[PDB]
Amino acid sequence: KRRVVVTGLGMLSPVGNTVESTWKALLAGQSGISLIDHFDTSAYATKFAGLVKDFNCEDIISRKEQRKMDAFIQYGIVAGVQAMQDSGLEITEENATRIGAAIGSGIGGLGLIEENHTSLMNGGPRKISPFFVPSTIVNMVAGHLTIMYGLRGPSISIATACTSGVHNIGHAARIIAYGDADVMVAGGAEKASTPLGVGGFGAARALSTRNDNPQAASRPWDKERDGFVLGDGAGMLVLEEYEHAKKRGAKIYAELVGFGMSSDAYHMTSPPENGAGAALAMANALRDAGIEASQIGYVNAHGTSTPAGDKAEAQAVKTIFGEAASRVLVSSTASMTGHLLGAAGAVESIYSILALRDQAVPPTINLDNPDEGCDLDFVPHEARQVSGMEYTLCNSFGFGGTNGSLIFKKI
Amino acid sequence: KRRVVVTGLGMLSPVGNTVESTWKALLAGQSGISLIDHFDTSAYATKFAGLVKDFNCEDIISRKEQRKMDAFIQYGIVAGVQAMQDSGLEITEENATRIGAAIGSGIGGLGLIEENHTSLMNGGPRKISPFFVPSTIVNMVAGHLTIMYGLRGPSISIATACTSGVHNIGHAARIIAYGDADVMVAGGAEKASTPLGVGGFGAARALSTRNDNPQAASRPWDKERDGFVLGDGAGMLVLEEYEHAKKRGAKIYAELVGFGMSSDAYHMTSPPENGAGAALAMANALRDAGIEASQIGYVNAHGTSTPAGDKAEAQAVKTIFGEAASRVLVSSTASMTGHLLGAAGAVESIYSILALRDQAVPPTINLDNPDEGCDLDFVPHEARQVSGMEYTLCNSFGFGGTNGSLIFKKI
Numbered sequence A, B: 001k002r003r004v005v006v007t008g009l010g011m012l013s014p015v016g017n018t019v020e021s022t023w024k025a026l027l028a029g030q031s032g033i034s035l036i037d038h039f040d041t042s043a044y045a046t047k048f049a050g051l052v053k054d055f056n057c058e059d060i061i062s063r064k065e066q067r068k069m070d071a072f073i074q075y076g077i078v079a080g081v082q083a084m085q086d087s088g089l090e091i092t093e094e095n096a097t098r099i100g101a102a103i104g105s106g107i108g109g110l111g112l113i114e115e116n117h118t119s120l121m122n123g124g125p126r127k128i129s130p131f132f133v134p135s136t137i138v139n140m141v142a143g144h145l146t147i148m149y150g151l152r153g154p155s156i157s158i159a160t161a162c163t164s165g166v167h168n169i170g171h172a173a174r175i176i177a178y179g180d181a182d183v184m185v186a187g188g189a190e191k192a193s194t195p196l197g198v199g200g201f202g203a204a205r206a207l208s209t210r211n212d213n214p215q216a217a218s219r220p221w222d223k224e225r226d227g228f229v230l231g232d233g234a235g236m237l238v239l240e241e242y243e244h245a246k247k248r249g250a251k252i253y254a255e256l257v258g259f260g261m262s263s264d265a266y267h268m269t270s271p272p273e274n275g276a277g278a279a280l281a282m283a284n285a286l287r288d289a290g291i292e293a294s295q296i297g298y299v300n301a302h303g304t305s306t307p308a309g310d311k312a313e314a315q316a317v318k319t320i321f322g323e324a325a326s327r328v329l330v331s332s333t334a335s336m337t338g339h340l341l342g343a344a345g346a347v348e349s350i351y352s353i354l355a356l357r358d359q360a361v362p363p364t365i366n367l368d369n370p371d372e373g374c375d376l377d378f379v380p381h382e383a384r385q386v387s388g389m390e391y392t393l394c395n396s397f398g399f400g401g402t403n404g405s406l407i408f409k410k411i
């Protein structure tokens, strides 16, 4: 009966380009939302995003090599090395076969897609780069990594939009537990801060528009919210079976103990006023982890700062916790970071992990005037210290009404 | 100990728009490769593809609704209903919760992506449709279906390029086996026959160029092959736990018994001359299915008709079977259909399933002069009758050196 644990973290976010820095900034209640300058946003209703500041990979990827890879791919490779080094794991011939990857993304190479398409409009097919396909496709983060580290184990890539980070990790854990693998680098990476990304989500009227105050735009559960805030980043984890980890004295951040999935079966982009699906997903994980809602100390909300989004989730929480509704801590890091799409559930799994380590809980900044019936403790404004928190649960929900929840446990 | 079985099939291919018709054509050695007329291919090195002929969904999707969905999405919904009807399964409140989906695609809405991007180049962001995001994203086939059939169980979507069909199905099976679900509609859908698809794979020089004879272009293992042939389609399956199926007297096509994954850890688009990774993947499935290579009657090659591709796979086969190398039947349906990218491993799982039903094995057409050291029986030219075939194995391999194999078993 294989127990899956976390032995390495790696991350690039709108508030730090390392695990420890992003964590520091998050507790400090720092925002990473800035105005876009890599493209002309004049015609854009939204002109800011949670961006990755001063990203450098020269030490990890030759410029010769970068040309074959969209930023989302670069981001994820960098965050994977971070995780691989941190794990300490050493790949051997008697090894590779048993180490794999489960990394995804919501869209992938949107930028190079725009680039190549543009090229094709101006110059014709001859202009499309020969690396177009392998530079934009979603599974290339895992493709490059497995190659870089000579990994021969199971490699998959889940693309479930906003839920991708949660799924990739959950299924990484599954794969190991099944016996198909002993280690798995898992998570998600996105960099959709483009014309098509900004323009697209803005076409659906899903994005916030507070351009006069980018850092205040993302306000989960607050009364004046007006749609999520797009963020770039990548969050990777090294999951591994308990024994295999011990036998090598790996530093163990925590143990993955539960994984729940569900479908809303309602709208293609809208959550039921109910939160019915989100509930089922949390519910399924509690049962998988074989524990009770009363046991969760901190929930990492999907809480993207869309009017319906946030109401629905809160509903679900009540439903799931009921009594413990108020005793439980719910917070949205998206308040500082924005929503990282495919990377979202991965970075937030890392938050949930660190929150157990440090017995501290990142705040929901910008929460000035919460909604009405709210009975919940959204850790508004400032970080929170905790005593005996043994479990944290992390939620993510995406389009197609696809939800997933992960439960982390101390030591 | 949950046994997963197949209780419903659904498909749209370049040789039929139903399971039974595509199967008939395949045994008959019919090609589905035609010249492209939906876009101007003058500047294109390749001017043909395996296309879906006279596709109609009016009875399944309102035109009001089609506008919100890329063809790949339409294709997959249609193929899913096919599967759902065929299953006979009836969704109930005491049900939904236990029925989910695992459907993917390599790229998804490439067409609407091109459309919206074009729009944006000409008109600015205001031109991007409000359904851009949910119309192109990869997980929307499963999103729409779960919605249409009120499914609340686990829904995921694997995007592992050319391997997607195999993975989605394998992980569907896993999910059920785990207990997370009782039924799962799984498979893949693609429709990359576009400027960016044709142009892109042609930029990598990966595509065949025999425009004077489209139907002969795809020639797996033959001496004059020059790169795969792009095909559109969608292949869906209804996987379900054995007991749950019986208790409802569901018609059972076969039982999924093995699932193997692997990584090449070599090149990002190229297979080792070795076939080392493909071997490991087949190998892993035999062990998962708990059987021997000697037991496989028919292998459904990835066999895309690329020079290296086909050599590498054949190598792997030898490696895995060795003795049984020659006694085993290996064939590439891609010889008639072309390669269906994300849909590929799904349709071919259906082939592998029907081949057990009918004890018949689709041919590798166009195989005029095979390569040299070939000791293998590629069922060249015409279909083959078989006696006591209890297992068929189906391979698929994609970019990022991601491989996966599935083992099907009779009754």
Ligand SMILES: *C(=O)CCCCCCCCCCC
Residues within 6 Å of the ligand: A105, A106, A107, A110, A160, A161, A162, A163, A192, A196, A197, A200, A341, A342, A397, A398, A399, B132, B133, B136, B137
């Ligand atoms: C979360 O579900 C929001 C939508 C996720 C879609 C993938 C990321 C957006 C790509 C944007 C245009 C292709």
Ligand SMILES: *C(=O)CCCCCCCCCCC
Residues within 6 Å of the ligand: A132, A133, A136, A137, B105, B106, B107, B110, B160, B161, B162, B163, B192, B196, B197, B200, B341, B342, B397, B398, B399
């Ligand atoms: C198989 O691995 C071939 C590549 C799969 C990529 C997904 C389908 C191609 C989309 C083409 C341009 C985006």
